[PDB]
Every structure is written in structure tokens, then in C-alpha cells.
Symmetry: C2
């Protein structure tokens, strides 16, 4: 079964739109036979009915509310009120019931088994296109730790994020990534930006393991015509079609 209880894939949904992503992401991990646990961090902005749909896919639906005065990140939010989503995402480090996790954004899709990511150590991530001496925070291998979590809150508090989101803050904290230990550089096929050199895709693209739907318009923002199995608007369109295939075929029949 999903017998590797000490390790997990972890995602985040702040609303019902992103929950659809999480549902496709979780489904895709199970379709490729992960033995690890599946965890989604959900905010109270996700509806009760959606939370129950998430429980049909994830082993743990964990509520995170940074607006709660009892939440560990709440005092940081009062200093940095623009960082609500980021501070929520950072709660991934609080999941100390696991020795090692791979965080994945809810706008990612798994195309092959990536259980080999658990061979990696904190902080392993793939390079960001556009500024490749920063890693992209859509997919990363980390070790839950209260110490680490509080150090991240400390940084967020004192300096904010240089990009207003989590990537800036994680790159600043884990600032040795670009120059130390090549094994912490995940291959780009573990976090393949849908924005990404066409001739490079032509030769390396078939080996993609994870696609990351970056940019404003997410897969669930597309109007899908199920009849034609297409969308209305897509450089390598197979991925968006795959997303909608998983959603209509594997996600929809789960709450009945």
C-alpha cells in the first residue's frame, strides 16, 4: 500500500480553485504508484464541502489558519500582512510526523513516479528559468523541523521576501544552493516550467517527470469542452489536456 508512512508529498490550497489543482496533483501521484503519504495544507477559505473532496485523495487534510492568534506564524503576519499565503506554505516545515517531504505547488502535475526524490536532502530543488541561480520553490525536498520553521519565520519577519512570495524567502534562507553540492540541484525535468528554448524541449521534453503550470492562467481557469477533449484559448498542449483528463476521468468520480 502507501506503506512509507515516514515520508510525504505536501501541497497547499488557499481556496477551492487551487483545491482542484491539489486534487489533480494527488491523483497523478497515485496514478504513478507512490508509496508515500499525501498531505494538503488547507486554509479556512477552502469550503467544508471541498475539504471533504480533498479527503478522498489526501491521507491528511491539515488546516492552517494564520489569522488565528494561536497559529505560530500569526505574529509574523502582523509584521508582514502581505505574506499570508507564504506564511501558510512555510507550515510545511511543521509536519514533524515525517522525516522528509517533497513539497509540490497545487499547479503541478506528476507524469512519472518521482519517489526517487526521497534520496535527496534538504534543500533540493530545480533551477528557476529566467533567474537560474535561484531555485524554483514549486517543488522541493525538505526535512520538517520546528527549528528550521522558526528560523524561516524570523527571516520573513526581519526582511520580508524579495519577490513578495515564498521563493524569495526560501532562496535567501537556503542561499548556498547555487554554489554548493550539485546533488541539491534537482534536474529541471522534476519541475518543468510550462513557459519553457523549444529545441531543448524537442530533445529532453519526453523525459519530463513533473510539469509546473506557472503564469497567471492556471489549468482550471480554462474552459474545457469534454466532447472535443480540448480547451478554449498551449505550446506543448499535451500537458493541459492531461490535466483535464485526470480531472474529468479520475477526480470527478471520487465524491459521487
Amino acid at each position: 500500500f502507501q506503506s512509507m508512512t515516514d515520508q510525504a508529498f505536501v501541497t497547499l490550497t488557499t481556496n477551492d480553485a487551487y483545491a482542484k489543482g491539489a486534487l489533480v496533483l494527488g491523483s497523478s501521484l497515485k496514478q504513478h504508484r507512490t508509496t508515500r503519504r499525501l498531505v494538503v495544507l488547507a486554509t479556512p477559505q477552502v469550503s467544508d464541502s471541498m475539504r471533504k473532496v480533498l479527503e478522498t485523495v489526501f491521507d491528511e487534510v491539515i488546516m492552517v489558519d494564520v489569522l488565528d492568534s494561536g497559529d505560530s506564524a500569526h505574529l509574523t503576519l502582523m509584521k508582514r500582512p502581505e505574506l499570508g499565503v507564504t506564511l501558510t506554505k512555510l507550515h510545511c516545515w511543521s509536519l514533524t510526523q515525517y522525516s522528509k517531504c517533497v513539497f509540490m505547488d497545487a499547479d503541478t502535475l506528476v507524469l512519472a513516479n518521482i519517489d526517487d526524490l526521497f534520496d535527496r536532502e534538504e534543500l533540493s530543488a530545480a533551477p528557476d528559468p529566467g533567474w537560474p541561480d535561484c531555485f524554483n520553490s514549486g517543488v522541493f525536498v525538505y526535512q520538517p523541523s520546528v527549528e528550521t520553521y522558526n528560523q524561516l519565520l524570523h527571516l520573513a519577519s526581519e526582511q520580508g521576501s524579495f519577490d513578495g512570495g515564498d521563493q524569495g524567502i526560501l532562496n535567501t534562507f537556503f542561499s548556498s544552493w547555487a554554489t554548493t553540492d550539485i546533488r541539491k540541484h534537482l534536474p529541471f525535468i522534476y519541475n518543468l516550467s510550462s513557459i519553457s528554448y523549444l529545441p531543448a524541449f524537442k530533445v529532453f521534453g519526453a523525459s519530463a517527470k513533473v510539469v509546473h503550470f506557472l503564469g497567471r492562467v492556471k489549468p482550471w481557469n480554462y474552459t474545457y469542452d469534454p466532447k472535443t477533449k480540448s480547451v478554449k484559448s498551449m505550446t506543448h498542449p499535451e500537458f493541459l489536456i492531461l490535466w483535464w483528463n485526470i480531472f474529468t476521468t479520475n477526480v470527478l468520480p471520487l465524491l459521487q
Copy 2:
């Protein structure tokens, strides 16, 4: 003086337009006090008058003609007639009068002394934006070798270049770059693509050492109004203005 005779910066001009780039690049290297030699590979498509202007900046203007039946790359050109420019560029490995060189495209500009690149070993290059598990071939540290040169011609012959240019072929040959030895990953500030995440530039951009004017429209294709010291059309415009400053101020007075 330029007393480090065993090592060189090497560029390439296939015509008079690109020669203007080479002139600004060479000037910029001397303005930042390189102790290394400056070499430009020139084709016969560069005019005699331009070749003499190049001699005012470069220590060696070396003619390369792949159309010559006596050129080492000529038989490869007959197999791969679309690769003339690439095969010319590959002649950088023939410069065995030097133990180590940094190749730089004529569409690059140096902003600080980068003599520390000679601490690096073959093949050291920075990641390409867009496909960051490939290195960008605009700037790279290499060791001239006839053996290596002929192995590159062998590859070009048998497989061409996956991108129709030199980057594909150099990435295929030096295919361990992405996964082996982080010291072969030049920091992105040694080959900063003018196309490149705005908030990353805002915090890391001031430390840029070399800018690479990628894309179709090169700095010399701009109409510069010297009066206003501007151009007609530029996200971080300082670089293009710097290019034209070096050209009008330091390049033009050199042949008189």
C-alpha cells in the same frame, strides 16, 4: 602589462556588424584591466578595413575560413553545410598556444574584471535561462586541445546540433555539466541574459559582471542619437547605453 600570455579571452566575428560587438567587448575587457590576451576569430566575410580596426584592440586577429579545403573543419562542413558559423566558433579549441581560455560571444559586454574565471576548469559555463540544465555557450572556460577539437567535429558530423548552432553540440559533448561538479556552474552574473524575473534582478543585478545581448536585435542594430545619449525602440536600459558609451567613446577614436 597584458603579461599573462598563456591565457586568453576569445571571441568571433563573421561579419562587420558582429566585429563592432567584438570591438566593444575587447574594449570592455581592457577597461576592467585584464592581464590576459585578447583574441578574435575572424572570417573572410569581415572586410580588410575592419580587420585592421580589430587589430587596434585584439592581440591576435586569427583568420578562420571553413570554405577553405585546407581548413580542418571543411569536410565536416560538407556533411553539415548549415553549421558554418558553429564550425568556425569551434576553432577556439585549436588555439593551443594557450593553456586555458574564456570564450565570449561578440554580443557580450564586460562590466567588471572577470580574470577569476581562469581559476575554473573545462567546461565551466553558466546556466541558460529557459532550459537551465543546459549551459549557455555565450561565455565558457575551456582548454584548447586538438584532441577535443576533433572530437567536437566528430559529433557535429555524426549528429549535427540539436539547436542548429553551437550550444546544442557543446551541451551534448559536455553532457555531464548539469549533474557533476558545481564549480563548473559559473554564476549567472558571468553571463546575464538581457532577456532576464524582475525582482531577482532588483536584488542580484547590481553585481552583474557580464551582460549577454541575446535575441535578434543586437546593440549595434539600434539607432543611437549621440546628442541625447539614448536609442530608438530596454527593461534595464543602462546596459545598451553602456554599450553605446564604450563604442562612441573608446572604440571610435582607435583608427582615426
